[PDB]
């Protein structure tokens, strides 16, 4: 039935006079797929939506929200497109030169070089990494700290009742905000940014976002056993739990 739904979109996109209904329905369809984490499904739909839809449509409470929801959804997708690239890279680290104990004088020199070339690649694989870390992070904070009212949260409050959508928007927050936090923690930990890891407890507990309400009690503790792990590595470095110099 996947196709039935992703195909009803091209029918609504065809007629430009129904772009407001095409987007709204595109949202709904992408709300079902997100709850299943079908990101190639959600995105295959996301491209069918002409890149210039938003511009033309220009506002009923149903169109202000659907424009916001669409960008929220793009902010979410882009937060998985850049992580899978980053993650793919983290798993392609240059491998150490192989050792040939009891080497011939030939094998000694081939190895002096293979050992010197590797000490060039590992520097760039931290180079490319840093730039894929700086980018995946930004996206994770665009979703977690979504501007003007939080992620998947309507700004317009005068639409007509849509319990399906509304409760779909509360759910999407409870499936994906705990899951984006845990990823960002995994990104920060993987790159050794431990001080910042611990600063996820400010972001989450914050009264500005009230992200902690989107967490189950279990997920919290789990995030608290994740932070205590970053803390350790900060002690091993000689700093206090939170990364500040011990005077």
């Amino acid at each position: 039935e996947d196709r039935l739904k992703i195909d009803v979109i091209d029918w609504l996109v065809f007629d430009p006079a129904q772009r407001a209904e095409a987007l709204k329905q595109g949202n709904a369809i992408m709300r079902k797929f997100l709850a299943s984490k079908k990101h190639e499904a959600a995105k295959e739909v996301f491209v069918k939506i002409p890149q210039d839809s938003i511009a033309e449509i220009y506002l009923p409470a149903e169109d202000d929200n659907a424009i916001r929801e669409h960008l929220c959804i793009r902010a979410y997708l882009e937060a998985h497109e850049t992580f899978n690239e980053w993650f793919k890279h983290m798993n392609s680290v240059p491998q150490k030169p192989a050792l040939i104990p009891q080497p011939t004088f030939t094998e000694k020199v081939a190895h002096e070089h293979k050992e010197k070339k590797y000490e060039m690649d590992f520097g760039i694989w931290k180079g490319h990494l840093d730039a894929l870390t700086a980018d995946v992070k930004e996206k994770m904070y665009n979703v977690l700290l979504f501007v003007d009212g939080g992620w998947m949260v309507d700004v317009r409050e005068d639409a007509k009742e849509d319990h399906e959508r509304t409760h779909q928007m509360v759910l999407l927050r409870k499936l994906c905000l705990p899951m984006l936090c845990f990823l960002l923690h995994t990104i920060l930990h993987s790159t050794g940014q431990y001080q910042e890891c611990l600063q996820l407890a400010d972001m989450v507990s914050s009264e500005r976002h009230k992200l902690y309400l989107v967490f189950s009690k279990e997920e919290l503790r789990k995030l608290l056993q994740k932070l205590r792990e970053s803390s350790l590595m900060l002690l091993d470095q000689g700093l206090d739990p939170l990364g500040y110099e011990i005077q």
Binding site: N84, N91, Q95, K96, A98
Partner: protein
């Protein structure tokens, strides 16, 4: 079964004719093989084949083109004689059943001489004397009646005897007739032929004795327009009257081409089928050498399809049927670069129609008829018989019966097509090819495996396994039903030393090992399952192997990379369980290895997997 009693009997006869050619034996007489069934039906059909045999029993030039034999004046002349000999003998049987009530009744008393029969035939059909007869009588009958019906029965000798007893009355007709009986091809010399024709035309154009009129222009082949309707009232009497009047190379003359065309063009089926008697028209076309017309015509009668197809086959196995080159033409047509007086039969279409009826539930019999198309191809080059077997297998789905079932023990019990050609590698791929194009992989594998095409068998077997690698193998599941066939293909491929290219082959045996890895993992045999994954050297367990294992993943079949997620988790969960039961350092070290590998590998669900892997390693410490 879709075959009626008559059709079935013909099928068996065509199986024999095929069994003979398939084993190289003598080419038996097809016409005889078909008349063998005709006698099981009413004589309406028997008398047809009698005509078919006698019309095709002409001295031919073996290994000569069909169009050439049928255009040659040599052959065209013998057709007329074979027909006249049929119309004469056929009429002779009518004269017997007219005098005696049954052919058997005539035989027991003995067939009388054609003279005494004819005399005993005149008694009935003219009891009282007609006042317009001439030249007196002979032993109680008009001399001209005896001469006509004797010639009609085909016994010229019996007719000449009548002439010898009326020498004084008949005048100069004796020396003329005695020449006709002597000269071959039922023709007189131009000089004498001129003498009699002018005499008849002089003052006998309208004589009160119709029998006299008939004989004269049967001997002189004159007055072609006058159908002598006084004596030739039946249709066969007309055909016979005219075939004794046709000529070969300008006035008062008729040729076979004109006559054959004149008959069906001006007086088509409509004229000869008003009495709702179909064979009457068929005999008109067949006894005039228009075999294609008669075949198509008779092929449309839904009750006589069987008979018309076979009379086509006979004409086809005798190089007498004129096939239509193009397969896009109608059933009956005249080629543009041929004379208008001949027609052509789209033989390919003819059989294709007949077959569709009983091809669905009677495949064996269908093949016997498809064989006659072995000598023809299509626009794309395929062999028509081979293509017909492909289409018949795609539709009927009768693989074991027609293609030969390849059991799971390594045997190949031959199929019905094996009889006709020993090169069965292409069609098995053709049938396997489409079923592959229709997502029927489990079948395409069995079919490709039937032709020992391991390149395709293992390819498809890779696709059917990868989805089911991590699944739970349960009784009658789709895993068991696929794993058990894959293993039955692994043994038969090792015992027979068969293998595809190493890429396809390596992946195939690799999946089989993984399927064993999860079957042991889902059973709780942790120790045993850990040992298997270690052999495969697919997931690194010591930090030193990470570099090489990571490079290998890049060129491993995507059917493997797909299942990498479930492999890492099972392997981790394996170490995970063994931890709760120095060794602790060793598991801890291996735990780390899996993570770094997964970290450097971009793969399916790397997000959820890499996270779970790290959590399970933390609980260990």
């Amino acid at each position: 079964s879709s075959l009626d009693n008559i059709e079935m009997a013909y099928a068996r006869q065509i199986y024999i004719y095929n069994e003979k050619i398939v084993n190289g034996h003598l080419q038996p007489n097809l016409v005889d093989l078909c008349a063998s069934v005709a006698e099981l039906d009413d004589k309406s059909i028997s008398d047809m084949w009698t005509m078919v045999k006698q019309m095709t029993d002409v001295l031919l030039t073996p290994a000569t083109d069909a169009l050439k034999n049928r255009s040659s004046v040599e052959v065209r002349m013998e057709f007329v004689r074979q027909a006249l000999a049929y119309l004469e003998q056929s009429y002779k049987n009518y004269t017997l059943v007219t005098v005696f009530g049954n052919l058997h009744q005539a035989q027991l008393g003995g067939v009388p001489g054609t003279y005494q029969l004819v005399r005993s035939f005149l008694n009935i059909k003219l009891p009282a004397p007609l006042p317009g007869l001439q030249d007196g009588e002979v032993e109680g009958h008009p001399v001209w009646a005896l001469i006509y019906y004797c010639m009609r029965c085909g016994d010229l000798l019996a007719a000449s005897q009548v002439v010898n007893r009326a020498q004084h009355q008949l005048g100069e007709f004796k020396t003329w007739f005695q020449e006709y009986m002597n000269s071959k091809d039922r023709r007189l010399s131009p000089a004498t032929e001129n003498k009699l024709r002018l005499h008849y035309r002089r003052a006998l154009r309208n004589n009160t004795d119709p029998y006299k009129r008939a004989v004269y222009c049967i001997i002189g082949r004159c007055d072609v327009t006058d159908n002598q309707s006084e004596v030739a009232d039946k249709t066969e009497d007309y055909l016979w009257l005219k075939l004794n009047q046709v000529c070969f190379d300008p006035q008062d003359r008729l040729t076979l081409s004109q006559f054959q065309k004149q008959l069906l063009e001006d007086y088509g089926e409509s004229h000869f089928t008003v009495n709702q008697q179909p064979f009457l028209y068929f005999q008109v076309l067949f006894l005039t050498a228009q075999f294609e017309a008669a075949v198509a015509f008779l092929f449309r009668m839904e009750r006589l399809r069987c008979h018309a197809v076979h009379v086509a086959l006979v004409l086809f196995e005798l190089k007498l049927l004129l096939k239509s080159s193009g397969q896009s033409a109608q059933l009956l047509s005249h080629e543009p670069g041929d004379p208008p007086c001949l027609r052509r039969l789209n033989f390919v279409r003819l059989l294709m129609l007949y077959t569709r009826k009983f091809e669905s539930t009677d495949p064996r019999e269908a093949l016997q008829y498809f064989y006659f198309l072995r000598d023809e191809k299509d626009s794309q080059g395929e062999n028509m018989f081979l293509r017909c077997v492909s289409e018949l297998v795609i539709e009927s789905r009768e693989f074991d019966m027609i293609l030969g079932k390849l059991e799971n023990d390594g045997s190949r019990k031959p199929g019905v097509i094996d009889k006709f050609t020993s090169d069965t590698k292409p069609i098995i791929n053709k049938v396997a090819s489409v079923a592959e194009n229709k997502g029927l992989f489990e079948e395409a594998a069995k079919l490709y495996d039937l032709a020992k095409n391991a390149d395709k068998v293992l390819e498809l077997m890779n696709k059917l396994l990868s989805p089911v690698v991590p699944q739970i193998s349960a009784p009658q599941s789709n895993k068991e039903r696929l794993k058990n066939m894959a293993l039955s293909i692994a043994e038969r491929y090792r015992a027979q030393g068969i293998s595809a290219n190493k890429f396809v082959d390596s992946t195939f045996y690799l999946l089989l090992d993984l399927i064993t890895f999860f079957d042991e993992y889902h059973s709780g045999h942790i120790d045993r399952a850990f040992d298997i994954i270690e052999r495969l050297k697919l997931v690194p367990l010591n930090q030193e192997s990470v570099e090489e294992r990571v490079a290998a993943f890049r060129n491993f079949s995507d059917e493997i990379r797909h299942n990498l997620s479930e492999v890492l988790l099972a392997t981790m969960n394996i170490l995970f369980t063994q931890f709760k039961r120095d060794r602790d350092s060793q598991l801890r070290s291996q735990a780390r290895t899996l993570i770094t590998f997964a970290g450097m590998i971009p793969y399916r669900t790397s997000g959820d997997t890499n996270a779970r892997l790290v959590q399970m390693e933390v609980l260990m410490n």
